[PDB]
Write a protein that binds this ligand. Structure first.
Ligand SMILES: O=C(NCCCc1ccccc1)c1ccc(NC(=O)n2cc3ccccc3c2)cc1
Ligand SMILES: O=C(NCCCc1ccccc1)c1ccc(NC(=O)n2cc3ccccc3c2)cc1
Lengths: 464, 464
């Protein structure tokens, strides 16, 4: 990895565009205008990409040669980068202040700030904008996943009277559906801020290396079938596949995809009749989890529950909701996103089915179908020092008032009612709102403040 | 990187679920039936993750320890992995056959096939499904980018009579808007299959290392301003920022973001009057590229052109379309996706403005706002050998006929009309069509067939 080649190309030309005699460039990150966001992911970026000796003679030379051909010109600031290498032994003279990881902050508040610590490195602040703006992705995955936890908590509390097993109700199925291996690890780790169920193995090593947990692993999985392990038995031997799989995993929970040919027939005749004796004998700690994987997600879930409820002994819980026996559960792992999750739990509640009966598996909806536009994550310059005089800087486009940026030195404070407020124009210097809630997390190539994954989970907890 | 930890967790349990005495598991990838797809990206995956000694004693031990905690059970095929390490020195006994990279294939056709070459490694075929299915991402970026090239080619030919500069009309602005650094490189490389303009530097090193070009670089950029380089001058000094930037880049093309405060005022009064003398003196090889960055993308583009057309000498080309002078161009780099690109070029054509006047910059729309659902990229088992007898396997869900998978051994052929056909059930073995268009690209840990980035671009060319 070469930080000199980890920026948008046009940033290579910006050192020539700032007003002459600029000694300071101060910039901030916010999720402009999903009313609250989970701040997570910055620590990964600081450790993997920004800390220590990030500049070498070889990296300067590599970047010089690439930019010469990429621009068909020599616009690359070799002098500026050589200065960092000679003066600071390749350590970035940058200071980053951030809100603690796991923090749940309303939209339109400063989340982190970046500024150069050496007047010669005024151009460095916005050079690293590209790498830091990528924090949008673990922030959005964590926020969207927590918003799904809120829906699940509401319906589970309503239909069961408690939140037992909440942290296992939304399972990450997204490994194949993401754009890369690196995205998988980052995305799966952000989902693990709110839940404990994951199949995206990549997320576990990321948490271990960059955050750390008291427990040996932050996430868990159960054995489960795929279409290939059922279909390989042949069209006429689906019962044999099912029987073999539940016998191989007789003492542990097992998920079995049952829609290869006909989900309703598999539920009513195979599980419901032919193999029913192998299901009713299972332990409460080792249920059979039936998995539909096609059709309308809500209509399929309701029909599968109606079928199972007629083949198996259904009880009525203390809230008046139907509950499958403890050796039998369902997982809907096709077409699950925040909108369909909501339609399914509401549809289940209307048909008097307890949310304790179901878990959700989400792939693309959880980790891929997200953009920087969802929370409007933006990095903007708000303060500059030119000729020793500080000026409050901002954009305010005529056709888009929502794109107006904050002015001057920023500070995050607790209001008297215990809410959050961002103070602009260095007004935080007046001691009217107490202490700034951002902490120096990076200074001159060193990570100065870190959070464990346990702290992050605690900060990201629901009020509920 | 550890391939034993680069799969969906549940795949760790599948070796126990296949029918006993299974010696072969044969699977294929297709974009289930954007009528045609660009096949690109597999070569990157084969080289970075699948080739050479991918199994070591340390990797087996690491995976064993992780899976023990992840499952709270010892469900990990240590014996199977130890077999690969001892017999093949950690090289995968897999054979991958694929359509050549850059190939443009209609939906619902086999693109690549995977099968184990050793009977003991029947479970390996679908173990690597997760890593190979991630090919969906460079395939979708390449396909969506080529579809935008088709729209641009149609409107540029209609309004100018040629395709000059077509390869520079859609610029990659997506670095900050993607989920990770790795995604950035893969995504920007897939856009470079169709275009030459990129700011996502990461894509250049990926092409150089995995594909290679005769040219020193596959992509180019121009100097350009950002809001920070303009706003840093102060709200009252936007004209000074503009003047400084165009003077610093007087001899090369320069893009200048002009919507910081009021895009229409910047076009009419700053560029159109105060700085007009610095613009009209510019070379044809060094235009000023005005960049709006907010508002309704089409309304803003049309209003900017109407303003500029009244301040600068406009000509009418041989097709009857208005053309700005050669030292002045526009780039729309906000809210550009395949749908808005289409609305803008159609709206320009309706107002008699040539497409030679404009270029597009696309960020999230180009590299992030894509999912595996767009082309329905899917990996499925189609053939198995159990007890020495081959059987044609497939899924066919009752509620979703579109999810039906192909049966048996597959081959891709040219039809008599020169189209593509996928033959099922080993019917390709009858010599009724020509040669199978799938070639072995990977066999027993070695990459057996490679394509240069030059070949890929030629294969992905538009008919026009
Ligand atoms: O229901 C589940 N968890 C919570 C309840 C479990 C429980 C209840 C009571 C006692 C003990 C345990 C559950 C079900 C299925 C799965 N996994 C699958 O069905 N997979 C993994 C996939 C990954 C990618 C693509 C497809 C996949 C299919 C995981 C967890
Ligand atoms: O119009 C362009 N290229 C094709 C025509 C150029 C031409 C015509 C005639 C003769 C010589 C050359 C062009 C314009 C802007 C840009 N770049 C920007 O505006 N940037 C890069 C960004 C990256 C991230 C975020 C924001 C960005 C802003 C690049 C190329």
């Amino acid at each position: 990895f070469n930080i000199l080649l980890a920026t948008d190309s046009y940033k290579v030309t910006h050192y020539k565009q700032y007003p002459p005699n600029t000694s300071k460039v101060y910039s901030y990150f916010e999720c402009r205008e999903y009313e609250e966001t989970v701040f997570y992911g910055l620590q990964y970026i600081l450790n993997k990409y920004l800390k220590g000796k990030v500049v070498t003679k070889e990296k300067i030379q590599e970047a010089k040669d690439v930019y010469k051909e990429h621009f068909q010109d020599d616009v690359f600031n070799e002098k500026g980068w050589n200065y960092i290498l000679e003066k600071y032994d390749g350590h970035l003279p940058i200071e980053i202040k951030a809100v603690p990881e796991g923090f749940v902050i309303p939209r339109g508040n400063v989340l982190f700030t970046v500024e150069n610590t050496d007047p010669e490195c005024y151009w460095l602040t916005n050079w690293i904008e590209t790498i830091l703006v990528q924090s949008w992705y673990p922030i959005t995955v964590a926020t969207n996943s927590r918003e799904q936890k809120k829906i699940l908590a509401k319906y589970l509390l309503e239909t069961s009277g408690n939140l037992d097993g909440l942290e296992y109700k939304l399972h990450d199925f997204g490994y194949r559906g993401v754009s890369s291996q690196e995205t998988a690890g980052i995305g799966a780790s952000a989902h693990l801020v709110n839940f404990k169920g994951t199949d995206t193995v990549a997320g576990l090593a990321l948490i271990k290396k960059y955050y750390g947990t008291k427990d040996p692993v932050p996430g868990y999985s159960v054995p489960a079938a795929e279409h290939s392990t059922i279909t390989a038995w042949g069209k006429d031997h689906e019962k044999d596949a099912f029987e073999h799989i539940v016998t191989q995993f007789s003492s542990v929970p097992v998920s079995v995809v049952s829609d290869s040919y006909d989900i309703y027939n598999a539920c009513e005749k195979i599980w419901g009749e032919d193999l029913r004796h192998l299901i009713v004998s299972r332990s409460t700690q080792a249920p059979l989890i039936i998995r539909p994987d096609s059709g309308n997600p809500l209509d399929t879930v309701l029909k599968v529950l109606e079928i199972l409820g007629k083949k198996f002994p259904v009880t009525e819980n203390s809230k008046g909701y139907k509950l499958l026996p403890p050796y039998l559960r369902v997982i809907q792992g096709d077409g699950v996103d925040i909108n369909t999750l909501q339609e399914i739990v509401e549809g289940m509640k209307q048909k008097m089915w307890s949310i304790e009966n179901i878990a959700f598996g989400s792939g693309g909806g959880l980790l891929q179908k997200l953009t920087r536009d969802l929370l409007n994550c933006s990095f903007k310059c708000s303060y500059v020092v030119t000729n020793g005089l500080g000026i409050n800087v901002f954009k305010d486009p005529v056709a888009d008032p929502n794109k107006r940026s904050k002015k001057g030195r920023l500070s995050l404070h607790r209001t008297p009612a215990g809410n959050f407020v961002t103070l602009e124009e260095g007004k935080g210097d007046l001691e009217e709102y107490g202490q700034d809630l951002l902490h120096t997390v990076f200074k001159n190539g060193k990570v100065t403040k870190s959070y464990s994954f346990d702290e992050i989970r605690k900060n990201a907890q629901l009020n509920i």
